[PDB]
Amino acid sequence: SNNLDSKVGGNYNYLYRLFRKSNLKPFERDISTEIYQAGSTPCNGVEGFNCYFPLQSYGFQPTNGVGYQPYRVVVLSFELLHAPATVCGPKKSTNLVKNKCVNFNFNGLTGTGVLTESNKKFLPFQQFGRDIADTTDAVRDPQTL
């Protein structure tokens, strides 16, 4: 992101925690601006000897090296819970062919058969039909109803 986060004279908005008393734990966000106690003497909110600010600016300039030019980093973490999983893939579909023995796969129900233009009258919320013996015989096409 050099052209964006690097400007003439340098960009110093982005910082980094320079001192910390412990290594961070997974996904741990620490924004504390406590003046770091580098020594044994407490700082009491006064900068000085062994009392240094935790955050330091970044060197982002157009003429900087690649190792120091700005980079925009996005980390995506996938979480599974004891809940409905609401983020999915696109799941593109294929064409619809009738009057031919095809191995279909509609919304969730799969099978093999010939798909023909039926004259059954589903209700608007109903998705597929069942026979007297719990066998699916009619399916509403998800793309065109």
Partner: nanobody, 127 residues
Framework: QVQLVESGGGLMQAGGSLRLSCAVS????????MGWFRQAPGKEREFVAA????????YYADSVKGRFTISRDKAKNTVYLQMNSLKYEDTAVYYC????????????????????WGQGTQVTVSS
């Protein structure tokens, strides 16, 4: 956009006190730090005092420690320069300055560049 409006100061006797202000409008310097500069005739402009805008921790030059006091008010967006214990050598035009850069070392603000500056206020010491 950004303007630094100084007020107060002028002529004061030896041993007297002055207090300077610098109102910033159109910009806030939360993580950055503001500083003061003075230029005696025939000499280069030098660092006076800086204060961290968010934290209030103040850093001073060697020749100004113990006589000058800097403070800032976030609400009023104006920095103060309490200037006690005058010396004749302080005679110079004081400039309130602003920089866009955030620095861990509060001493770095005496050397690091400033992108915003005031109009300059004359300070004269009389005996």
């Amino acid at each position: 956009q950004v303007q630094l409006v100084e007020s107060g100061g002028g002529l004061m006797q030896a041993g007297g006190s002055l207090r300077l202000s610098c109102a910033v409008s159109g910009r806030t310097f939360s993580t950055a730090a503001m500083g003061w500069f003075r230029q005696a005739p025939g000499k280069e402009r030098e660092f006076v005092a800086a204060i961290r805008w968010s934290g209030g921790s103040a850093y001073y030059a060697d020749s100004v420690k113990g006589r000058f006091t800097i403070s800032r008010d976030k609400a009023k967006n104006t920095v103060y320069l309490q200037m006690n214990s005058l010396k004749y050598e302080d005679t110079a035009v004081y400039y309130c300055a602003g920089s866009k850069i955030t620095r861990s070392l509060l001493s770095d603000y005496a050397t690091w560049p400033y992108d915003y500056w005031g109009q300059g206020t004359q300070v004269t010491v009389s005996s």
